[PDB]
Design a protein around this ligand. Structure first.
Ligand SMILES: Cc1cc(-c2n[nH]c3cc(NC(=O)NCc4ccccc4)ncc23)ccn1
Length: 340
């Protein structure tokens, strides 16, 4: 069932996830095609938490490089609400699909990276982390406008509670995971997103994922295979006994030069890549620094890189709420879109 009538008709498949599906549809009010994401999260607490976070975040945000929510469709009562549909702008493709079919020139890479970082500056200024940046979540049109989508794994930043043990399970897409995820981090600091952006830049440079780990620890094998052995100083910052012991046990690995991996890339793009793909998250470049990097000099304009008016100042505290209370919160958050 894709129950979005009567305003939205002539449905066509786009993609799907574990508990949702996105289709294109014709909007019979504005006479334009739109994207509609059906979400069916109510049987699981975790899915309810993610759905609620995405809706709350996207409804507060207003930025050219971030997908918005134009409409939310759901039943008039909690009892009758089994699914929720989110209406968004329809784009033409995503960076994942684009990279299967063509090699991007440097000036397209530069302009796309600029937009990713512009959008990320706004997200981070709101004290929010995206936590699942990857090519399929970067939507594009023929005018080369780029929008960040899929905030289902987003969280309010919590650097004071980022610590976790060695080899702790993680939810976000493997290939875009920072090394610290596998060593000592829950992915609750802004630096997690900068690593993912670095991976995306590398992927735009060669049309191949830079660290295609086949399984959980293999992801760290791929990262260390290019960055080489971490310095003593970086090891001194590693926190966990088990993470330190693991890294000290490895044979010495020298770094693979970015210009040997990417022999046709712009030298300024590789300098910025090096700074985003820095092993130690405390030394990794921040979003505002990345925007100010010489690679992006032609687009850099802090006056035209807006920040959020209303950041999320507190944790949402959804972790111990039962799925029934979360359904009530999702119902209340979506009430503004009901007729009348
Ligand atoms: C033709 C085309 C359009 C789009 C596209 N336009 N607008 C969109 C909005 C969204 N939103 C969105 O939240 N997508 C992620 C998702 C989808 C389904 C299940 C779980 C997560 N996704 C794709 C799109 C993406 C790719 N090709």
């Amino acid at each position: 069932v894709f129950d979005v009538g009567p305003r939205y008709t002539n449905l066509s498949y786009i993609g799907e996830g574990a508990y949702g599906m996105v289709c294109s549809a014709y909007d019979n009010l504005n006479k334009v095609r739109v994207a509609i994401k059906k979400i069916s999260p109510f049987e699981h607490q975790t899915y309810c938490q993610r759905t609620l976070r995405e809706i709350k975040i996207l409804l507060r945000f207003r930025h050219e490089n971030i997908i918005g929510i134009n409409d939310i469709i759901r039943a008039p009562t909690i009892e009758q609400m089994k699914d929720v549909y989110i209406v968004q702008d329809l784009m033409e493709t995503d960076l994942y699909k684009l990279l299967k079919t063509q090699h991007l020139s440097n000036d397209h890479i530069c302009y796309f990276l600029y937009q990713i970082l512009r959008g990320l500056k706004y997200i981070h200024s709101a004290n929010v982390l995206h936590r699942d940046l990857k090519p399929s979540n970067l939507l594009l049109n023929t005018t080369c406008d780029l929008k960040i989508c899929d905030f289902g794994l987003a969280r309010v930043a919590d650097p004071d509670h980022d610590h976790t043990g060695f080899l702790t399970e993680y939810v976000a897409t493997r290939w875009y995971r920072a090394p610290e995820i596998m060593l000592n981090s829950k992915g609750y600091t802004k630096s997690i997103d900068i690593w993912s952006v670095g991976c995306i830049l590398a992927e735009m440079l060669s049309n191949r994922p830079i660290f295609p780990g086949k399984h959980y620890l293999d992801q760290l094998n791929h990262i260390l295979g290019i960055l080489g052995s971490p310095s003593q100083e970086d090891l001194n910052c590693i926190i966990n006994l088990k993470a330190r012991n693991y890294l000290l046990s490895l044979p010495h690995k020298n770094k693979v030069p970015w210009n040997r991996l990417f022999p046709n890339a712009d030298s300024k793009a590789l300098d910025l890549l090096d700074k985003m793909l820095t092993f130690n998250p405390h030394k990794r470049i921040e979003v505002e620094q990345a925007l100010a990097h010489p690679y992006l000099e032609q687009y850099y304009d802090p006056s035209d890189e807006p920040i959020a008016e209303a950041p999320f100042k507190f944790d949402m505290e959804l972790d111990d709420l039962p799925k029934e209370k979360l359904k009530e919160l999702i119902f209340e958050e979506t009430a503004r879109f009901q007729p009348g």
